[PDB]
């Protein structure tokens, strides 16, 4: 209600239908809410999930889920912040990180991916060992 529901960029019919696909007893789990956010093209982190859990627990009513989705819009996101994070690790200044170097970063810190998730994501992007991380960040943001 106080949330930015109007602004939520997403087809509202999909928002509802995705909720009905995953809801049980009128509520949707956080895991399924984040899944739906992703299907709608939003990118929640653990910070977003923690915020909504702190407010409402593990199972959200429809209204609460709408509020969760509005938390997930991340208008501030840009490619520069993503590139700069990887550039931290590019100490020899090549413009590339290997798949192993990328796998290590993505699986060791933050909202760590599993080895298989990282590997699958990197393999989906490129068949070569050297990854242009600028192009990778451009790809994931869209």
């Amino acid at each position: 209600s106080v949330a930015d529901i109007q602004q939520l960029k997403v087809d509202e019919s999909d928002v509802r239908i995705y909720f009905n696909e995953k809801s049980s007893g009128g509520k949707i789990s956080i895991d399924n809410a984040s899944y739906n956010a992703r299907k709608l093209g939003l990118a929640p982190s653990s910070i977003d999930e923690k915020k909504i859990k702190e407010l409402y627990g593990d199972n959200l009513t429809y209204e609460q889920y709408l509020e969760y989705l509005s938390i997930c819009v991340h208008d501030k996101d840009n490619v520069e912040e993503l590139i700069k994070m990887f550039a931290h690790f590019d100490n020899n200044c090549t413009g590339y990180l290997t798949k192993s170097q990328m796998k290590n970063i993505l699986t060791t810190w933050g909202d760590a991916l599993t080895d298989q998730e990282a590997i699958d994501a990197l393999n989906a992007f490129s068949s070569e060992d050297n990854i242009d991380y600028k192009l990778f960040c451009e790809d994931i943001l869209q």
């Binding site: 956010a37 991340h74 909202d111």
Partner: peptide, 15 residues
Amino acid sequence: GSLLRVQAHIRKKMV
């Protein structure tokens, strides 16, 4: 920080 945004967009893409 940034890292989380990177991981978030990868999870989005792989869905």
